[PDB]
């Protein structure tokens, strides 16, 4: 079988300066598939208020494999941030690819401040909608 | 580049 070896995922959390989110608290994207025949479950799961208090000042973000067929598979991926005109911004990427195990995350804990992000003159946060890029490629 | 998971397993 033919495989999406890479994809990108768009995701817009609306009224972002609104979530409620304490630290350590999570906001979960949709599912999203690759690989044989969508075999490959992942899914977003952002803090917005930080995942713990080395990252209090940050927002963590990190791409999580849901499931897969086997017992894991390998993947590079890049976060960045879509500006009003959909531009990429503020990207990090995992240089090389990690091991993802059923159930296992992947991601920068400190990937950007929450007070450079909420900042207006920044322009991230267009009608207070943050909206993040995960490019993913998985290794074959 | 500062790639982090939020569980560890042996």
Not at chain 1, 9 to 30: D, H
Not at chain 2, 1 to 10: A, F, I
């Amino acid at each position: 079988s033919g495989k999406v070896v890479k994809f990108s995922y768009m995701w817009t959390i609306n009224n972002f300066s609104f979530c409620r989110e304490e630290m350590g608290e999570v906001i979960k994207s949709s599912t999203f598939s690759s690989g044989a025949n969508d075999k490959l479950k992942w899914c977003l799961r952002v803090n917005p208020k930080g995942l713990d208090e080395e990252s209090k000042d940050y927002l963590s973000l990190y791409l999580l494999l849901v499931s897969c067929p086997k017992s894991e598979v390998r993947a590079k991926f890049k976060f960045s941030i879509l500006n009003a005109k959909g531009e990429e911004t503020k990207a990090m990427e995992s240089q090389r690819a990690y091991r993802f195990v059923q159930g296992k995350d992947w991601g920068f804990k400190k990937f950007i401040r929450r007070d450079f992000l909420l900042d207006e003159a920044n322009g991230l946060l267009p009608d207070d909608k943050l909206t993040l890029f995960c490019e993913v490629s998985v290794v074959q | 580049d500062e790639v982090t998971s939020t569980t560890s397993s042996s």
